[PDB]
Design a protein around this ligand. Structure first.
Ligand code: NA
Ligand code: NA
Ligand code: NA
Ligand code: NA
Lengths: 165, 168, 167, 169, 169
């Protein structure tokens, strides 16, 4: 095990801010105990799991229903009833503050040709939405013939702290 | 080499990471390493590998006009598959739901299509791909209320209720 | 210097990680560079490591037969489509795993439920699976009818012990 | 010291030389347990799924019919997700996502894809897209529909500046 | 400070660190805190989603009808995403993504997949693909349509060189 001097200001700069140069010729095999030392891993797929208690289930027809309206990060997944882009029947996921509204998932998308018999399919969505104070995430159907369906849960608080399942 | 470290941040972390049985500096020599952690843990720790389906671990289901339990013991479960789409006004229901016998929540729903100008309603698969955590008393199930619709797919237990990974 | 550690969890993990038929911490922080990726042959990021090549690709297009995709131990990625049929159809197209005794379907085509019509339109039914085979296991594609197909590609991602196979 | 061995690997030697520019490599036979303080020392970056979240303030919402609509035209990284109205491959009705500098244009999501047979009654479905696009100076990301019958619908947001610095949600 | 009993670990170390002149492995009970400088040493890195972004300059756009069109034919890792025109599995109209070396060819995305029943009016939908392909010397990634009625549409870009070195967007 010997040392050689390094020429690199970036590494030197990086190290300085890390802990307020030379290299070794011997490669050391290691095992990393960091996760165990921290109290156990928080693998993302598990942390975001749906539970009976945490699931915000929704199935909206001819009404407007709030999915969430408290600050934080939310996963939202589901489907809309597709309609002709020329249709008046709206089934959307939207966010609003009572002043403006933005559609995050839109159903009025199909463009049939040569027929008035318009088949419909689910339009999927899978979104991560952050709400601040005064914001509402909602599902809106304006017509008895279309639905907005799915599930949501709060993934983190507004400060970005993860919420256990 | 060796210099002194001033970090409340690093000091506090190092002491939480490595608790002392009893009531900091840095080196200026960079050490090249190789990491054997994954092998030491038994291999196949990368998420895609660890979550793999096997003949032994696969909970296969294909549900028509009945209710079928996928899991009813605590843990984390991956569940993937399809439902038969129907009109949003149909009586033919195919769902994935979670329940404790008191509250029930649908996680995947088939009643979604909205045809116009026709009574000949075409159907497509409605996919789902879910991670569900069950605690004591919870059931994950597939349910079809009609011989004309199915809920089909596969599931497996990914981890125990405390998050410990289950190796396939 | 060094100091004794009181952590039952850390002690247990270290015992498990580095088994021996036979605990402290340091206060000096060591800067490192990690050569593991190069030592493994490079291109270890998951998207690169799992790439398909002309040589490694198990291509399949199965009609009215059973075709083995893999039958040796390891982890396999398998992706593709089935021909959708009515949920009451006799025309079956599946991905399944079997040991010659038990068989489980991993992807199923018999899913659509038309109403008010006998003219049944069909779409691809996609699948994207990670399957681990052990000794004696076969992953296969099967179509029982000339009208339906199982199409796709697969490759071996790792050996049965989890060691990655580079493309 | 625990027993060491000479490592014979040009790739590892060359890599170490580029990493740590001014060797005869050796390896050690003792496995050392470590804990990593890098994240603690660095700042503690936000998990990607959270960092990329859509908000009422940050979302570039679009619903485009018979017009060309800019999604972004300043440098940076943008996530753009949504759907196009499918049409027959021989259709004249175009609904696309495209990037352009005014000299050339590339379609990143194309709607004219279906190939019906045995019928002139052509059903349509959404054609989804989910893209990460980097714009440099002079580039425009846009949604374009050339006809009242087809739409481009979706959302976008700026994920990072052109230097790769992440933007908070 | 202690002997390790693990053939799996010993074999792994031996593979990682080759030695022509090739012993008991050992472990230490002293946990060492580290910081990882690798990213800075490599010149810096970008998060994967940003690194893989499409740009006007890097995008290989294709819209293929009744011809064979090369997407890439030099070594490297390529992301390729897009759609094929679906047809009946019994159709003669082919739209595929394939890889070839001029002797062997394999289809990576296939359009002839639908199985209508009780009708000769066969509706078509996009068949999506999203692939990572590694080409070595002599390999070609291509889109092929054998009929004017079917298309292969999409975008691709080179993600890394053949050794895995990442290409900046
Ligand atoms: Na209704
Ligand atoms: Na039935
Ligand atoms: Na056939
Ligand atoms: Na219109």
């Amino acid at each position: 095990s010997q040392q050689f001097r390094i020429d690199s200001e970036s590494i030197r700069d990086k190290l300085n801010t890390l802990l307020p140069l030379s290299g070794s010729t011997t490669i050391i095999p290691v095992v990393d105990l960091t996760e165990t030392a921290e109290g156990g891993a928080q693998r993302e797929d598990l942390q975001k799991a749906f539970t009976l208690i945490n699931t915000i289930d929704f199935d909206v027809e001819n009404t407007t229903t709030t999915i969430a309206n408290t600050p934080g990060f939310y996963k939202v997944v589901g489907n809309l009833s597709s309609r002709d882009e020329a249709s008046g029947a709206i089934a959307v996921i939207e966010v609003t503050d009572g002043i403006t509204t933005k559609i995050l998932a839109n159903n009025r998308i199909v463009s049939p040709d040569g027929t008035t018999a318009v088949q419909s399919v689910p339009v999927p969505f899978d979104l991560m939405v952050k709400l601040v104070a005064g914001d509402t995430l909602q599902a809106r159907s304006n017509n008895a013939e279309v639905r907005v369906q799915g599930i949501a849960r709060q993934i983190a608080d507004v400060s970005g702290n993860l919420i256990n399942p």
